[PDB]
């Protein structure tokens, strides 16, 4: 499994021989923009399983 990892989650930055399927999280940095045209980045964390 060629998987994604990194800060803003660049692709193909990790290789896995097994699939992690337990309750865990991975964090991402998301740049968005409001209706006032003010740009502001975020830091999130996605609890998954």
């Amino acid at each position: 499994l060629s998987l994604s990892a990194g800060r803003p989650k660049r692709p193909h930055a990790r290789r896995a021989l097994c699939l992690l399927l337990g309750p865990d999280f991975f964090t991402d940095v998301i740049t968005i923009e409001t209706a006032d045209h003010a740009r502001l980045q975020l830091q999130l964390a996605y609890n998954w399983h």
């Binding site: 060629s2 692709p11 193909h12 290789r15």
Partner: protein, 42 residues
């Protein structure tokens, strides 16, 4: 020319090994396809 596949084999009388030839670039794709992961990525 045929393909004998399976058990161990001794070429009898009137048999010789036939080479199979491939188009250009197929041979470079046969061996890369064992794990072409990152190539498939980008």
């Amino acid at each position: 020319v045929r393909a004998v596949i399976g058990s161990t084999y001794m070429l009898t009388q009137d048999e010789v090994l036939w080479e199979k030839e491939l188009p250009p670039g197929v041979e470079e794709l046969l061996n890369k396809g064992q794990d072409p992961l990152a190539d498939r990525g980008e």
